[model samples]
Target: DPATVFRLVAAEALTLTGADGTLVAVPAAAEELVIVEVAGAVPAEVEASAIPVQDNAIGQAFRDRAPRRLDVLDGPGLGGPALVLPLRATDTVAGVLVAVQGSGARPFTAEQLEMMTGFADQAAVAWQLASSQRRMS
Candidate 1:
């Protein structure tokens, strides 16, 4: 029940933060940035591939294993403030977890990061379970 797992994990995120936002990321070894998780609202846009700014964020967070936060400027086409954290699996970053806030919203709080990290850990286990399930059948 991957969908159920995802829903429970997503519900936990909202419990951490009253703010309802979505999670986005570029998968490991993936050329395009993908929105992997959305908790409250309908998932929005994502880039087909990395741009300079996004590539820098993705590369550094994944390679350096540090969480990065930045404010998104308001323009004709722009998202919003984001914090990207790498999901650690073994010694490597399995993937990324991104939380985007709407315009003028403050950055993610320490509590939110803690909860998201915990959620991401569950997601990694789900990933392994799914992979193993496929191999068994």
Candidate 2:
């Protein structure tokens, strides 16, 4: 059900902003993140591996609890007007949600970011419930 919820939000996020792709990254370690979901053609290079919590837009949003946009990401396989945000989770952030447009697409809008803020709140609560249930399982 949690995964379903994640999917609901992820799909909505993708469609809402007309993004070419989107992803959900949950903390796998205090300083590492693992992608739990991928929708559409998310940056080809970002699909695998444990992302370090340093020197990346995803990590920066995680660190600062804000939405971050990168015009051209670190090494570039994914050309972007990419956005990363820390979806709030209780006392700390649980993860980051990323969305990107195609290389030639327009930049994400301020209104989209505002909508994403609500998605962030809802997604985090779902994560909280899911995480709590996992302990009892």
Candidate 3:
């Protein structure tokens, strides 16, 4: 359900902002601590399998528990304006959200940043909620 919830959040993201794509990266299940997965985005090539985990923009957003902006995507042949922010429900962050617009697209406005942060946090809570239920069941 979290997967569905995440994509729903992603879907809602694009229409309201200039971003053409939205990539939601949630950490891999507990067994693989370093792996993070891109929920999906047709505009970018970041598919499943571990993306660069550290020392990169995505990692920095995850590490800082704060939002960041990048003019270009930190990936091969993928590019555009990126609005990166850590996704969290409570004290700890759960993942990172990158809202993107292709080349020539201007950076997102601060207001869009606030709204997407809200959606991103909602996505994190869905993940938390699903995990909690799984644990109890």
Candidate 4:
């Protein structure tokens, strides 16, 4: 079921990031959206309104179908600093990877970004696998 698909994707992100929390937001189409967040140490909300991705790195990645990252010292935009990674498979972006610390937290290192990107790629593959299996059945 898609619920199992959701759980698998969340677990994969947690495994890759070693993060207490993880979230995966899938676009219903090129417009609609669905978001799921599994919290660890800290609880943060996943904002998934009808608002088509904003002008942040996440939205840009969605538009260009490329991965992007944003680190805000003072404040990059509305929600402040955040790391946005795009999940891609078969040249299509299926989801987004977002990780954030507290307001005064240090910027994520290059290694962390790389890890997140890898997680995105894996998620994309898993999603594709699930989709393929459904179609096959």
Candidate 5:
């Protein structure tokens, strides 16, 4: 299924980043958006569980429905150069794919950002198909 497909994509997407990476899926019926999968090395706080959908690059990308590249404002945990792309499954935003380069790591290149955006879009399509099939079942 595409959920498993997404999981594999998330796992492989780690190679596209420097250090930390995350893939979040927002369910329509839930108040909380959960981290469906992750890639590369991240802080324990981030890898342990759910992520906040506010005051961060992930949230900003989802809010704007576009790709964003910036240094994290927060003091700790993946606080470095970050790139986030919105995963739009349809007309609505469905999730986010976040990539980070740890402190002192080089900033993300434009090519990398473009590639990640495309990857996020593909993941969104897979998610939409999976969701539709689940509903039918």
Candidate 6:
């Protein structure tokens, strides 16, 4: 089911282009991650938005190809429950998508987790596809 979502995102990313006719790759979740969109958000801010995938719940999900959630302190714009999901593309680990709750916001419900996983799955595929395409070009 998640893979199905990934497939769709990859298909869409193939057509996701910026104003300058450049393909826009999805953000690779990481420490000091560089998200090409949202021009004003710097690397530090981006990094603060989510935890690294290697030593946190997100990392476990990515490594095991499953969805995971963690209760975390406030970071930049993140708070409460942080959900992380793997993004696979072309049969490889492409990246992870991290979703964090806002300050004072309620914890993510079961339905919300499922929904976020679905979206993140798609995002992973799209980002990976764009990365692969970039390598070819």
The numbered model that scores best in TM-score is 2
- Predicted candidate 4 versus true structure: per-residue lDDT over 4-97, tens digit per residue: 5656666665666654455556676375445654444334454343325665455566667665555551221223345567778886777666
What CA root-mean-square deviation does each model show from the true structure?
4.3, 2.6, 3.5, 3.7, 3.0, 8.8
Ranking by lDDT: 2, 5, 3, 4, 1, 6
lDDT of 2 by residue, 26-130 (tens): 776378877777777765456455777898778778888887666655322157677676888888787888886667667777877877888788888987888
| Two-way TM-score contest, 4 vs 6, winner | 4
Best by lDDT: 2
Cα misplacement distance, residue 137 of candidate 5 (Å): 1.6
Clashing pairs in 2: none
In angstroms, how far off is 80's CA in candidate 3?
A: 1.8
lDDT of 2: 0.73
- Looking at candidate 2, the ten consecutive residues that score lowest on lDDT are 69-78
State the TM-score for model 4.
0.73
lDDT of 3 at 21: 66
Q: Scored by CA lDDT, what does every candidate get?
A: 0.55, 0.73, 0.64, 0.59, 0.66, 0.45
TM-score of each: 0.61, 0.83, 0.76, 0.73, 0.77, 0.53
Q: Candidate 3: worst 10 consecutive residues by lDDT?
A: 29-38
User: In model 6, which regions exceed 4 Å deviation?
Assistant: 1-54, 73-79, 102-104
Q: Count the backbone clashes (under 3 Å) in each candidate.
A: 0, 0, 0, 1, 0, 1
Per-residue accuracy of model 5 over 48-116 as CA lDDT, tens digit each: 355556766665566778887776624223667777778876786777666666677677788888888
Best of the two (2, 3) by lDDT? 2
Residues 1-137, model 1: lDDT tens digits? 43344444445555555544645344524444444455554344442333232446655566677766667622211356665666566644556655556777776667667766776776767755665687788
